[PDB]
């Protein structure tokens, strides 16, 4: 088949290239369309549909079956965001900031920002609850790290906030996820394990003030975290980093 | 205003040190390495061009 | 415009340079001070390369090359036609590199997340600086670089290579290697396995991150998990490009033979060295 | 009555004029250099 | 503040430069200083102190 | 601070058995010990491993292939164990030579061993396709990663099998050795022109390039919304959270386009697979089709010709 | 013609002018890179060549 | 054709001015580069051996 | 009805497409003179 | 330049000067070598 | 008065006004180092 | 062949204005290069060889 | 024969309208590239043949 | 052999409709291309000859 073309300098290495070009037009196209299945159709700045949508049309839709009985979910669908969002428009003109109304940590916008997920703990192959307190998980224990139970808390005020009381663990990945801080008012809140660094003598939080340790949403049952509660929590901590750059 | 035209010369300056600063680094970083292979022996083993 | 959740992500804040100067998005991207500069560097030197290609004489974009200085001009300027254009479009392609980067940190400190994609880019943008700086300012001249064309640039690559011999015996270079076929088995297998498990046998429930878990128990007798998935991937692509660096820093500075030859230091260990047999021997 | 940037009638219209006078004084900048330098190296 | 397995890496760095240089000269070759400072160097930073 | 590269402190409990679904828990073993190591990095338990009717027939032709290349090597060595350990990495097992073609007459020093050691390596990886098939369809998953390896059988099957059934000659095929298939791969690019100007060997490089970035900016953007516990994809796609969420408006307002929690998945074992894909079909057309890269670019609008 | 003034009720100021500002200055680069890659009209070589520098 | 104008009433015109700047400015640049090409209309070429400057 | 996806009605779409005409027929307008400057400077037929 | 000053109610004039420091210092390092590469005018060489 | 920024139109004045005399005076000084350079060697 | 309008009930206008407005481009772009690649319809080097320009 | 528009009610319109687009183009692209690589049946080539256009 | 209609209560006739039709479009395809690769059946080249278009 050496140097047999069918017509000018087209052989068998230029009908694979062309067949190739073609293939991955297809694939790039099948990969956005899949793409596609969250956040769309586009949106005005008001709420409204956008009038430009883009060059690919959207996906038909598809059906995921949750586990234990949570139900189905159809994507893409009608997703509305069913929380108020404190923000106002600094110009008429669209591409410009929204400005918080109010208190952004508090309020839930910009890097402080959390998602409407389920209000119920998420669940293992068993259906157990996924995360528990140290204390709950029977035969768990902390072994080959600095053990943070019983070091101080200190914000990025250089201020002590309270004190580790137990570690949050991932029953399946069997890896600490949250830790219980026990604040002035012997009232406890969770921190996020990737936003604080274990020290030798202390547990140290960058991204919260000792103060603003204070406002940390809360678990209503001491035993379990539901995704909601996870999201309120882990926003809170992460817009700390942009809304408490002031002290 | 005086201390306004002090003040659009600390802007102007803040945003012209800056921009020296780096550049001048980056001098002394390629002075640094024209320096550390002027030490090695390259002169003596000396490579082909291999743009052709 | 937005996303179904876009709008509540878009707060005035998070900038390095500017304040509410730049501090708006031009359709779904955000320009900063560093995007307007990344756009800057980048059409220029797009355009740079067009005039190029217009003093070269060829329109076909499989053709067009640019060239750097001969290496008879050292460290020095070029005229721009004989070399000064490489030179202006390398400075542009360096500073849409970093202008893009720090663009990437202003978005990461908007969104409240941490700096690993700009500390990953910036492992890739050392990379180009040392096969584009660093390498010939320690060899001495500019035209020790690479050209900018599609199938010139594998030309340097080859003739680089065939210079010390066959090049896939650089003891860094098979440590890349190693960690880049690494990585793409890596990057295949991890995507498979959560496909598979979101995607399941037709009629079924999705499966859970346990059963990932147990499939590679199953497959292998070990799960490094999500987690430990994720952080082996980007280590795996930062380490080969770090060792693809280094092999490359070391070729014409410190090495300057085969290195075929290089192997020998094994061979020739004292207590092993003049054992009649084998293949040396 | 078509508003996409909140300008009123006459905020845009002051806005043109200003506007223009910027780009008449560039524009007559740029037409001295060009003259300066066709008198200087013709190029047709 | 330096963490101790930081001071850890320092001095397991430093004792292998010191055990390659010293084992590069009491053998022949420049590989049995690396092995045996590479080994040392390893168990002494595998094994943090606090 | 914390950058989450290595876990900073590690539990341990009961160790996870695993799943149940309709695999045969006969076939299984026990759990292996800990490790604290791969416990900084990721997961600390061993085990246990499934081990049925096609893991005994994948063991046996993988475990026969490394014994017959290791005694081929003691072989080579004059059974020294100081020259094998001086000598590895230059030990090689060659196919026949050119004379003998397609034949199995080749004698056994010449390349008759070869052709034995690659009926067990061929043995070997197809019953590992097979098992990967099967522990994936014992737990009612996809079977996406039998694909992926399948590409992957794809090349090594023309490296090995098929391209030289084309080219008639078993002596095409690669040498069992460490330096002795690197020698070949460099013999095979200067033997067919410039493996640079096949435009499939472009391709692969292109997506394997592309599997390098992908997987960097990846693993990056998940370790970065990690504090959302962004790294529980599997729920981030069931329920869509604020780091998906502040994952895809980072690269959406980065370079404009954005992906979901699963579809990145999808354009990760497609950036794999083809890479794999495509150097199979360029290894195949070298030789066969062009016997000269080089100066098909020519013909080709490639080179200045 | 004398309705242009309305592009300001589409387009915000903002923008617009760092967008003019940018493709200004990268359009005036480009002519001089231009001139200066042509023998002819590169003025540091045509003042070497005149007067006699070398 | 006279009810050309309900265009404007499919797409924005915002979207409309941005990208048809971009494509008439593309366009531009590349018939000029075209030409610049062209040994018989790159204008520079042609003034410097009018003039006959070496 | 107004078939509208934009929200433009049919009196703003109708001034605004002439005041875009008006600006279509001055760039027109130049570049036929320029194309009359260079057609007799050097004529490409 | 009647009305030029009205730049001033469009841009923060704080960030407008430092970008400009930004922008001078790099026009001047610009233009200083491109005068340097050329082999007249480079005052270094003499 | 759009007031992006903040300023009235007198605060926008009294800046514009010292903003144009530093940008006299870095034309001047620009303009005595060009004419330096010209008399020590002439690019035209 | 009077119900062709039917297509805009199948097909959304703004997309099909669209590919059809870069298609269209596309393909005068690409005979225009037809053209100027065959030496007997490059009407540049028509005219420089009909007006002695040499 | 006559009930073949019940593959309307197998296959989308919308998508068999793009796909038919999309195949019809290529392939009357493919079949021109063909003729034009042919030295016999090149219309460029034959005119300029033809004519003495070289 | 007069029930093979009982096919397509195992078979959904939509993946039956694609993977024929892109089937016996490639398998056309790659017949007509082996065919303008032999010489003898190349009609291009028969009709070239037989007019002498050379
Ligand atoms: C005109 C020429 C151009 C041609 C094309 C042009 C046409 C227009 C463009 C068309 C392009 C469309 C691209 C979109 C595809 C994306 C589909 C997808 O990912 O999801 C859908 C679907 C499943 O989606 P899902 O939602 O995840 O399903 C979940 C299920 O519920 C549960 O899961 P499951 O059990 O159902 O299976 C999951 C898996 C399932 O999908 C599959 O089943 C794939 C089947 C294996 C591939 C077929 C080749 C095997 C050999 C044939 C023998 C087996 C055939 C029967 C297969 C059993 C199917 C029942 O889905 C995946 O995502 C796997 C992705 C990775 C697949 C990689 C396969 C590479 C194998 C390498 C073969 C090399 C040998 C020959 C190489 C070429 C020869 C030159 O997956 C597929 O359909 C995969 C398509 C496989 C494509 C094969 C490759 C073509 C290669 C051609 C290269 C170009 C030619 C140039 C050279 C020419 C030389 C002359
Ligand atoms: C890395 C070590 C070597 C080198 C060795 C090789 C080899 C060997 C090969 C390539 C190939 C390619 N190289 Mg190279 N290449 C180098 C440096 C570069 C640089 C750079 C600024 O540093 C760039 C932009 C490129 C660009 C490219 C592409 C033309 C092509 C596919 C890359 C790809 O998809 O990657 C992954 C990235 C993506 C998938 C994202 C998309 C990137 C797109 C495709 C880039 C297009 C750039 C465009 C042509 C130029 C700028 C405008 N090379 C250095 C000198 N490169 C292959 C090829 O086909 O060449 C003809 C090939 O065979
Ligand atoms: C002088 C050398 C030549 C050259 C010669 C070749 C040749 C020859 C080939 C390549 C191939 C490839 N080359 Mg090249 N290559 C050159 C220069 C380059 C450069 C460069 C910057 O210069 C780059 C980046 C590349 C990159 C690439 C890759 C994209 C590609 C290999 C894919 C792969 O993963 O294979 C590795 C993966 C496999 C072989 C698959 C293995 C799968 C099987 C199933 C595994 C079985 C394992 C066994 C059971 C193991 C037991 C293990 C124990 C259980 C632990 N080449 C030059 C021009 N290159 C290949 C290709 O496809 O080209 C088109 C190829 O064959
Ligand atoms: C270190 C681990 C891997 C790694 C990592 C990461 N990589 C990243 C990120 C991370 C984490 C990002 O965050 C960032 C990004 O956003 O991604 C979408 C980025 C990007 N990786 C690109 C290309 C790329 N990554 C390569 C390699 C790896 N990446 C390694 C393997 C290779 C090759 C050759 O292998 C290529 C070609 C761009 C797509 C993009 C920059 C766009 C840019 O900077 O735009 C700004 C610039 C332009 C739009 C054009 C400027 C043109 C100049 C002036 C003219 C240049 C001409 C050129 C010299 C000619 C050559 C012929
Ligand atoms: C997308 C393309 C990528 C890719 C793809 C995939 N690769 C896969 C899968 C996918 C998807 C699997 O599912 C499968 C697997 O289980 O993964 C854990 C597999 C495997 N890829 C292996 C090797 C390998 N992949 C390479 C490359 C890439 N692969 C490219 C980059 C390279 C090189 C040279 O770079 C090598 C050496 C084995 C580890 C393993 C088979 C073991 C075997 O066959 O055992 C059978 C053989 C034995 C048991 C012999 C044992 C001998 C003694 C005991 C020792
Ligand atoms: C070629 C194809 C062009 C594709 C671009 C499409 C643009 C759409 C878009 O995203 O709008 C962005 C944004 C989007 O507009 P928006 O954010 O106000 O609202 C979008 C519209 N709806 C309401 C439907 C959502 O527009 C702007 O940012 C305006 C900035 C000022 C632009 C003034 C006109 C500039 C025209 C180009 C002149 C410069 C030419 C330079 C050429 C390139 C130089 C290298
Ligand atoms: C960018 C790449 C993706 C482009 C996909 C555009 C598209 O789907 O068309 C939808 C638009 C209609 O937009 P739509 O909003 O109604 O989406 C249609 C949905 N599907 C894809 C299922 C049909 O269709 C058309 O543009 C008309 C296509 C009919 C004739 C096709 C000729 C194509 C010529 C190919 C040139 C090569
Ligand atoms: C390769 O191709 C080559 C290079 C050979 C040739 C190809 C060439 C091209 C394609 C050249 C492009 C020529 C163009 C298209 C030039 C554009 C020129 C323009 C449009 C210039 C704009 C000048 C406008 C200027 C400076 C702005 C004057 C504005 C002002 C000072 C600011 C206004 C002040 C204000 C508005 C206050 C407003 C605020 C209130 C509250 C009223
Ligand atoms: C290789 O091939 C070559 C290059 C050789 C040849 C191939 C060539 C091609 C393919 C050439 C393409 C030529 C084309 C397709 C040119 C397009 C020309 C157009 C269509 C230009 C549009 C000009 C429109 C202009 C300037 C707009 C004037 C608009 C205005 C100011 C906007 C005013 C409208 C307004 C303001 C809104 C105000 C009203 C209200 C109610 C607010
Ligand atoms: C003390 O140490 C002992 C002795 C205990 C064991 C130590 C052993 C060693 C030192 C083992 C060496 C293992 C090595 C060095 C293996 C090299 C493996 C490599 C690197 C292979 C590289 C490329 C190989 C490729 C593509 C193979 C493709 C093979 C194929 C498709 C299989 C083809 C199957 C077919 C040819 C022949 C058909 C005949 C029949 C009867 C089906
Ligand atoms: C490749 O291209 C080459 C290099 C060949 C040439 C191309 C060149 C171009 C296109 C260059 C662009 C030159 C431009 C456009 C320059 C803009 C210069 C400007 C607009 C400078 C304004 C400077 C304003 C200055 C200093 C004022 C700052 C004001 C102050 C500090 C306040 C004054 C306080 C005071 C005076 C009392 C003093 C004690
Ligand atoms: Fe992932």
Sequence with gaps: MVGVTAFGNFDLASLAIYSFWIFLAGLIYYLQTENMREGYPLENEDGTPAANQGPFPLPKPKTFILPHGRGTLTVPGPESEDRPIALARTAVSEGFPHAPTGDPMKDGVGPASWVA?????????????????????????????????????????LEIAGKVVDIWVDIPEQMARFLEVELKDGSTRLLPMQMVKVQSNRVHVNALSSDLFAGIPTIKSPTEVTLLEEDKICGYVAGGLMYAAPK | KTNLRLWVAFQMMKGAGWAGGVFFGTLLLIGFFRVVGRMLPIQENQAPAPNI | ALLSFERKYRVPGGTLVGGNLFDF??????????????????????????????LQGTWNPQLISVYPPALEYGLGGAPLAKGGLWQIITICATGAFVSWALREVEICRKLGIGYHIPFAFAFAILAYLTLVLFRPVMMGA?????????????????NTGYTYGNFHYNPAHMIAISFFFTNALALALHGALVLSAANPEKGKEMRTPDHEDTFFRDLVGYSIGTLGIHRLGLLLSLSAVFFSALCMIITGTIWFDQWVDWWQWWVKLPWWANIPGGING | DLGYTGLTDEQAQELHSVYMSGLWLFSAVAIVAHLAVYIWRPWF | EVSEFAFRLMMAAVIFVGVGIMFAFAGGHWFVGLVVGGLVAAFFAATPNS | EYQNIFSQVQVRGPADLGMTEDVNLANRSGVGPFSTLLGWFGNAQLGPIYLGSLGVLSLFSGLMWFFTIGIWFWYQAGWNPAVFLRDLFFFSLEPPAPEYGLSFAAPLKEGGLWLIASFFMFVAVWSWWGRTYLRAQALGMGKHTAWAFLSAIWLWMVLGFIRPILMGSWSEAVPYGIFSHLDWTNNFSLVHGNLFYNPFHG??????????LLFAMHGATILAVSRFGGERELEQIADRGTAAERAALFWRWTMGFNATMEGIHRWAIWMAVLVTLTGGIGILLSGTVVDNWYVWGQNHGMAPL | MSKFYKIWMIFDPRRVFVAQGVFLFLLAVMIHLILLSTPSYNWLEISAAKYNRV
């Design chain 6, 203 to 212: 391709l692969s490089i292109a997506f394997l390039y592309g599997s390098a």
């Design chain 1, 117 to 157: 997920r389920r209000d119920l703990p998420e669940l293992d192959g068993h259906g157990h609850n996924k995360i528990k307190p140290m204390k709950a998980a029977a035969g768990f224990h902390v072994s080959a790290g600095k053990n943070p139970i019983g070091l101080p808390v200190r914000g990025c005020d």
């Design chain 3, 142 to 158: 500019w035209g020790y670089a690479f050209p900018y064309g599609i199938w010139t640039h594998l030309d340097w690559v080859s």
């Design chain 3, 25 to 54: 998005w031009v359709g779904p991207f955000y320009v900063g001070f560093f995007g307007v500069a990344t756009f800057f560097f980048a059409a220029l030197g797009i355009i740079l390369i067009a005039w190029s290609a217009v």
